[PDB]
Design a protein around this ligand. Structure first.
Ligand SMILES: [Hg+2]
Ligand SMILES: [Hg+2]
Length: 173
């Protein structure tokens, strides 16, 4: 009989971002006629008390952590993690655990106002996909063979750069 708790969503979906990236935290919840305020929390600290969304214009490493929201009808949400990194490239995914059959969208994100070319996405040290100009790598339907350590690399100007690795787990069922 108890109403659903609030839910936090990130737009875009990437849980890890680079400093200077913009992130919008959205709160899915219900409001009563006399109180439509939304409360946002960053690691247990209150950060906002009215708007349904919390917009981070230019992320900093200090923004990393757990975020939760709530309304006066939808209770405290489970936490959503945001990781903020510093580097020329970042391999992004909407999550790090996928079920077999699931599509996997990876993005080799370059730092604000830089452009990457000759990009390769690698899995367990082996090339999985190459693009002459930076593009995303979509794995149609995940199999157990997709579990592993992923990273991407390419060129920004004449500088060879490589992202940190991201470990992806595929669960059965
Ligand atoms: Hg904060
Ligand atoms: Hg996607």
């Amino acid at each position: 009989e108890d109403l659903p708790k609030a839910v936090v969503f990130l737009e875009p979906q990437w849980y890890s971002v680079l400093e200077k990236d913009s992130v919008t935290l959205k709160c899915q919840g219900a409001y009563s006629p006399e109180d439509n305020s939304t409360q946002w929390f960053h690691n247990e600290s209150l950060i906002s008390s009215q708007a349904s969304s919390y917009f981070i214009d230019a992320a900093t490493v200090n923004d990393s952590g757990e975020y939760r929201c709530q309304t006066n009808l939808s209770t405290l949400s489970d936490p959503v993690q945001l990781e903020v990194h510093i580097g020329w490239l970042l391999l992004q995914a909407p999550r790090w655990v996928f079920k077999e059959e699931d599509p996997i969208h990876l993005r080799c994100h370059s730092w604000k106002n830089t452009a990457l070319h000759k990009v390769t996405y690698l899995q367990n040290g082996k090339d999985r996909k190459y693009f002459h100009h930076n593009s995303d790598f979509h794995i149609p339907k995940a199999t157990l063979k997709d579990s592993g350590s992923y990273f991407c690399r390419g060129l920004v100007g004449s500088k060879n750069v490589s992202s940190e690795t991201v470990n992806i787990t595929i669960t059965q069922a």
